[PDB]
Amino acid sequence: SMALKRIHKELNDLARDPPAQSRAGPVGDDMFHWQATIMGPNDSPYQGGVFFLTIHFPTDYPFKPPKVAFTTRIYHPNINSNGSIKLDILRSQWSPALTISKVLLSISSLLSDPNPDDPLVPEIARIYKTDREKYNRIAREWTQKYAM
Amino acid sequence: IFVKTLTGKTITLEVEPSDTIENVKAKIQDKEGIPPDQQRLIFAGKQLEDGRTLSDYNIQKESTLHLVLRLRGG
Amino acid sequence: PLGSMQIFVKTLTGKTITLEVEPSDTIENVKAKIQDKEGIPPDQQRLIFAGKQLEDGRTLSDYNIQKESTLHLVLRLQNTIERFTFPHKYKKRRDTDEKCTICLSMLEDGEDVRRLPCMHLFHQLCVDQWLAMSKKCPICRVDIETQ
Ligand SMILES: [Zn+2]
Ligand SMILES: [Zn+2]
């Protein structure tokens, strides 16, 4: 009752105003389960690639954050092989003033701005924090073999 | 330039190419009520840091920036 | 209104309103000038300058206000929400259309409405649920317990 109405309203605005380099929408008649496309950040090694994501809306939405996960494999210090994204705004820095289009654009901003000091996959963090040149090469190969 | 704010209202801003990003965040603070601590600006999927200017990103007239709350990769 | 000179006011989020005033302006006129720029009734406003709060029926020069002076704008005054927040019913002006960032529906006359010490606006039902679990503002991340 209380949550589906926002998902309805977000969807209408998404149709009339398609976001900047990002497409999303529900699967079938499941309004709490969406898919999403994400474009590559312009300077980052993921540039030009398209990344798929699963999103699940909790029943408490928008008071609790939506569960967002990558399905395309991506090489990133804060995104593991299971597609998980540990991101503060998806956990405790969550605000109900964030729509999906702005959540998705926040994720693309994370790709252009990794954080190795507080990592999720520390193996990827060390490679970044010692020679970003070799990190950018690997991340570029991952985004070209899965997301092009 | 234009800015998509958290309320969805695209707002016009009058800046010249010499303005830094911290300048732009301050103008948004006066028209939105959000401190530059909590402002994250995004153009073409990439974030914009407080140090560099608008011309350093070669952002030209009528470009549309987007505004989300400050993130922290974890 | 093309006042003889200008002053500024600062909200909790650091937002700055520039006003045109003459030293012979009453304070209730200053509150109304802010009403025509952000949509806050003088009913809700509380102004603070030089450690003292300004009373309705005096003048700016009585409080010895200068050019480039800065006023501070705070709100006038499960149940702790009603102790830090101002409830009222919205009144539409006449961009001046406001929407609730929680339910994403625009704000209408007669709707029970909420305003936080950051001078942001939401429906009463929508933000009362969110404040029941975070006590911060969805738009600017300012605690409602801020003073
Ligand atoms: Zn609402
Ligand atoms: Zn606020």
Numbering used by the authors:
A (entry chain C): 0 to 147
B (entry chain D): 3 to 76
C (entry chain A): -3 to 73, 258 to 274, 289 to 341
Question: Anything the authors wrote about it?
Answer:
Both E3s are positive regulators of TGFβ signalling because they mediate the attachment of degradative ﻿ubiquitin chains and subsequent destruction of negative regulators of the TGFβ pathway, such as SMAD7 and SnoN/Ski. Previously we reported that the RING domains of Arkadia and Ark2C are bona fide ﻿ubiquitin-binding domains, and that docking of the RING domain onto a regulatory ﻿ubiquitin molecule (UbR) enhances ﻿ubiquitin transfer. Most E3s possess a RING (Really Interesting New Gene) domain that binds the thioester linked E2~﻿ubiquitin (E2~Ub) conjugate and brings it into close proximity with the substrate. ﻿ubiquitin is then typically transferred directly from the E2 to a lysine residue in the substrate.
To understand the molecular basis of activation of ﻿ubiquitin transfer by Ark2C we solved the structure of the UbArk2C fusion in complex with UbcH5b~Ub. Crystals of the complex that diffracted to 2.8 Å were obtained following purification of the stable UbArk2C–UbcH5b~Ub complex, and the structure was solved by molecular replacement. The density was well defined for most of the structure, and for UbArk2C residues 1–73 (UbR), as well as 258–274 and 289–341 of Ark2C, could be positioned, while for the conjugate residues 1–147 of UbcH5b and 3–76 for ﻿ubiquitin were resolved. In contrast to previous Ark2C complex structures, UbArk2C–UbcH5b~Ub clearly adopts the primed conformation, with E2–Ub contacts similar to those observed in previous activated RING–E2~Ub complexes. Importantly, Ile44 of UbD interacts with the crossover helix of the E2, while the Ile36 centred patch of UbD contacts residues in the RING domain, including His314 and Ile333. Furthermore, the β1–β2 loop of UbD adopts the ‘loop-in’ conformation and is oriented towards the RING domain as observed in other activated complexes. Contacts between residues in β2 of UbR (Thr9, Lys11 and Thr12) and the C-terminus of α1 of UbD (Gln31, Asp32 and Gly35) extend the E2~Ub binding surface by ~190 Å2 so that in total ~1080 Å2 of the E2~Ub conjugate is buried in the primed conformation. Comparison of the structures of UbR bound Ark2C in the presence and absence of the E2~Ub conjugate shows that close-packing at the UbR–UbD interface is, in part, achieved by displacement of UbR in the activated complex. For example, while the linchpin Arg of Ark2C (Arg335) contacts Gln92 of UbcH5b in all three structures, only in the activated complex does Arg335 make the essential contacts with Arg72 and Gln40 in UbD to prime ﻿ubiquitin for transfer. In the structure of the activated Ark2C complex, crystal packing contacts position a ﻿ubiquitin molecule close to the active site of UbcH5b, such that Lys6 and Lys48 are ~11–13 Å from the active site raising the possibility that a UbA binding site has been captured.
